[PDB]
Amino acid sequence: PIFLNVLEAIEPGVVCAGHDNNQPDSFAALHSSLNELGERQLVHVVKWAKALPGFRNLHVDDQMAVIQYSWMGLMVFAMGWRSFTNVNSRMLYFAPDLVFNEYRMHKSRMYSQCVRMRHLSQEFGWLQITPQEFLCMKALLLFSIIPVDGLKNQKFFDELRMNYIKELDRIIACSCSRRFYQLTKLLDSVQPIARELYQLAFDLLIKSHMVSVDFPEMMAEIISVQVPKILSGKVKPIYFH
Numbered sequence: 487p488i489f490l491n492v493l494e495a496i497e498p499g500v501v502c503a504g505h506d507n508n509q510p511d512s513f514a515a516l517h518s519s520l521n522e523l524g525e526r527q528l529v530h531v532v533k534w535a536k537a538l539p540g541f542r543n544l545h546v547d548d549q550m551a552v553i554q555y556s557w558m559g560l561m562v563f564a565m566g567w568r569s570f571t572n573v574n575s576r577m578l579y580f581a582p583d584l585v586f587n588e589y590r591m592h593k594s595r596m597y598s599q600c601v602r603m604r605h606l607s608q609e610f611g612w613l614q615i616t617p618q619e620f621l622c623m624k625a626l627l628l629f630s631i632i633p634v635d636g637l638k639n640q641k642f643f644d645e646l647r648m649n650y651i652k653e654l655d656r657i658i659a660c661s662c663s664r665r666f667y668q669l670t671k672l673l674d675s676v677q678p679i680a681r682e683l684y685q686l687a688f689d690l691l692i693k694s695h696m697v698s699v700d701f702p703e704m705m706a707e708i709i710s711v712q713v714p715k716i717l718s719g720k721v722k723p724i725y726f727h
C-alpha cells in the first residue's frame with residue numbers, strides 16, 4: 487500500500503490562525519486572521535506538494551504554477567474535512583483558534599460563501615468519504631487547474647494526473663462505478679467554490695490596498711499575480727464531467 491502510506495505520512499498536521507478570540511468579531515480582525523492563516527497554510531501546502539509521489543518529475547516552474555493555482559481548492563477541501571470531523575459542519579473549522587459560527591459568518595461578510603463551504607463539508611458525511619478517499623481526492627485537486635496555454639512540460643503533467651486518477655480508482659476498488667461517479671462529481675464541485683473565494687480574495691485585496699492595509703506577503707503576491715489569471719480565464723479548472 488505504498489501510495490496511501492505516502493499520503494498519510496505527508497499529510498499536514500494542525501495549523502493555527504493566530505487569532506485572538508478575546509477581541510470582538512470585526513470584519514478587520516476576522517479577515518486579518520483568515521489571511522494570516524492562508525499565509526501559514528501556504529507554507530505547508532508547498533512542503534506537502536513537493537513530497538507527493540512524482541511531483542518532482544514536473545518542471546520546476548510548473549511545480550510552482552500548479553501550487554499557485556490550486557491552493558484555494560486544496561485549502562477549502564481540507565477545511566471542509568476538518569469541519570466534518572470536528573464540529574460535523576454547521577460551523578466552519580478554519581483552524582482550532584478560528585472557528586466560524588453564524589455570527590462570524592455574517593460579520594466577515596462572506597455568509598453565502600461560508601454556506602457553500604458548509605455544504606461541501608457536509609458532503610463528506612452524505613457520501614461517507616473515507617480518510618483514504620479524502621487523501622487521494624485532495625492530491626488530485628493539485629493537478630486539476632492549469633493555464634489554457636498548457637504548462638512548460640504538459641506531457642509529464644498529463645501522465646502524473648492520469649496516475650492520480652488511477653490511484654483514486656484503486657482506493658475505491660480496494661458498485662465501484664457509482665462511487666467513482668460520486669467522487670468525481672464532488673471533486674468537480676470544489677472549483678466553483680474556489681472561484682468564488684478567489685473573486686472575494688481579489689476584491690478584498692484591492693479594497694484593503696485602497697485603504698493601505700496590507701495582506702501577508704505571499705498572499706498579496708499570489709492574489710495580485712496569479713489569481714487574476716484565473717479570474718480572467720487564462721487558467722482554467724480541469725473538470726471530469
Ligand SMILES: C[C@]12CCC(=O)C[C@@H]1CC[C@@H]1[C@@H]2CC[C@]2(C)[C@@H](O)CC[C@@H]12
Pocket residue numbers: 517520521523524527558561562565579580581683686687690
Ligand atoms: C484559504 C482560507 C484559509 C485557510 C482555510 O482553512 C480556508 C480559507 C478559505 C477562505 C480564504 C482563507 C485565506 C484568506 C482568504 C483568501 C481571504 O482573503 C478571503 C477568503 C479567505
